[PDB]
């Protein structure tokens, strides 16, 4: 029934009827809308089928595009009520996902709520069409995964590795180093970059003051290295 | 002598002495500071050596880190004069470069000047240490290539391909399509992703209202696909 786990609803509550069904994975509840659901709530066998028809959204499976994301959304509380909230495009949460085909990332806008929503809780726009489902949060800030904003994906079956950086340290591939000399010595002695179906690329998120996304080959050679914003919230809880 | 090509200097001109040497490539002038220079001003034989010791800056070779970038810089006009300007972190130019080792990009902050500076013109901070050299410009806005702002690089010997998008088209790898069905059919029938030293990855910048960076394999399979901001100025002139 309820997608909000708290009994007393907070915020601006309006009478909006938004369908959802309730499910469970790994001891945590989640909701679906038809076949649409968060990727992190899917078993591997589910991902292997849902990945073949979905549109590419970070941490969401859906066979049809979601409706457009505007200035506000309604977040489902229960069968008959929803919370009306503004979208915040200034405060962004960094989402990651993998479905066995693509490893996606997104600098997602957020909404702030004192309610405790489960994964997969649907959000609708003014006309009642589903615009997104909830995925991850930090504190009271919930990401809104959609097709706007900075984001991307890597073509690989490997899941993300999520790591933390140290100030002043240097990073290449899977490794970190005290100095450029140590880093360059390592690079020089690696075999040449190679990628194939038995050697899929590994995506890495490095969190910290100067955060990075790295794509590294099975043999240790870098494929890509990117600097992302220190303002992104990368300490996130997948619901 | 002069790194500004106009005879009458505009702006706030101060007595600051900044060393530089004058050079020419393909009939266009450029300046160096010691061994430091813009990548786009180097011959292939020069790149092949300079690439082996340089630090990673988009479109700049330097064996030593540049000094920190703060709120303002002085841009060399001639042997004894420089223009005092503010750094603008709101208006960003998108830079690309390749040195045969890495294909880099950067969302660079800018400075505005009515003077016409050549490529490689040095910029210094309050203490006179070189902070960057000029690379590209759009209008009166010059990029400041440095270690700040979003950016990255791909490990490859290929140079960038720079393309313009068309309304209504979908993009995968090297190709564009009028419908999702045709795009998905194309992907399904490519050989599996493969990369090696005789099949290096190809970086592509797609410019337009919904711009992209795509890294594609020699055989046409994607390695990565990312969405970047339509506010980035991607129409730039390498000086």
Author numbering:
A (entry chain B), B (entry chain A): 3 to 241
Authors' account:
Poxviruses are large DNA viruses which replicate exclusively in the cytosol, and encode poxvirus immune nucleases (poxins) to degrade 2′3′-cGAMP and prevent STING activation. While baculovirus and lepidopteran poxin homologs share <25% identity with VACV poxin, they are functional nucleases and retain 2′3′-cGAMP-specific cleavage activity. New poxin structures include the alphabaculovirus Autographa californica nucleopolyhedrovirus (AcNPV) poxin from Group 2, lepidopteran host poxins from the moth Trichoplusia ni and the monarch butterfly Danaus plexippus in Group 3, and the betabaculovirus Pieris rapae granulovirus (PrGV) poxin from Group 4. In spite of dramatic sequence divergence, poxin structures from each group reveal a shared core fold and head-to-tail dimeric architecture confirming poxins as a single enzyme family.
The structures of the cabbage looper moth Trichoplusia ni, and monarch butterfly Danaus plexippus poxin enzymes resemble self-cleaving proteases from positive-sense single-stranded RNA ((+)ssRNA) viruses, and bind their own C-termini within a vestigial protease active-site pocket. Close examination of the high-resolution 1.45 Å D. plexippus poxin structure allows complete analysis of the interactions between the C-terminal peptide and the surface of the protease-like domain. The final five residues in the C-terminal peptide in lepidopteran poxin proteins are highly conserved and bind within the protease-domain pocket through hydrophobic interactions where each residue resides within a pocket of corresponding size and shape. Authentic proteases recognize their substrates through similar sidechain-specific interactions within pockets adjacent to the active site, demonstrating that lepidopteran poxins retain a protease-like mechanism for recognition and positioning of the C-terminus within a vestigial protease active site (Hedstrom, 2002). Notably, the protease active-site pocket is entirely distinct from the poxin nuclease active site, which forms at the dimer interface between poxin monomers, explaining how 2′3′-cGAMP nuclease activity could evolve independently within an ancestral self-cleaving accessory protease.
